[PDB]
């Protein structure tokens, strides 16, 4: 796989792991999103250090107001925080 292709298939398979066992086959749930993001980004993203922080994200992703997160919602989330990291990385150069 190419560097970019490498990253596309990764988000798609890891999401299948939590989403198809502790929840709906093709849909995520309030507890599945928290587990997927924290397990590998526990110390990074703001989740466990701020249980409230996970809730702010669901609100932003609860666009349908379904109380669940679709792969179209989750992928939008990881994509938007990493970009914020590059901008705050140049603040201290």
């Amino acid at each position: 796989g190419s560097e970019l292709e490498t990253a596309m298939e990764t988000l798609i398979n890891v999401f299948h792991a939590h989403s198809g066992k502790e929840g709906d086959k093709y849909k995520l749930s309030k507890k599945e999103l928290k587990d997927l993001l924290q397990t590998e980004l526990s110390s990074f993203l703001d989740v466990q250090k701020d249980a409230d922080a996970v809730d702010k994200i669901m609100k932003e992703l609860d666009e349908n107001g379904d109380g669940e997160v679709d792969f179209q919602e989750f992928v939008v989330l990881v994509a938007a925080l990493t970009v914020a990291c590059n901008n705050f990385f140049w603040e201290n150069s």
């Binding site: 250090k49 701020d50 932003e60 925080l81 914020a84």
Partner: peptide
Amino acid sequence: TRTKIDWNKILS
């Protein structure tokens, strides 16, 4: 607040 990170809130 240092003991905790509110960066994701940056998104909101």
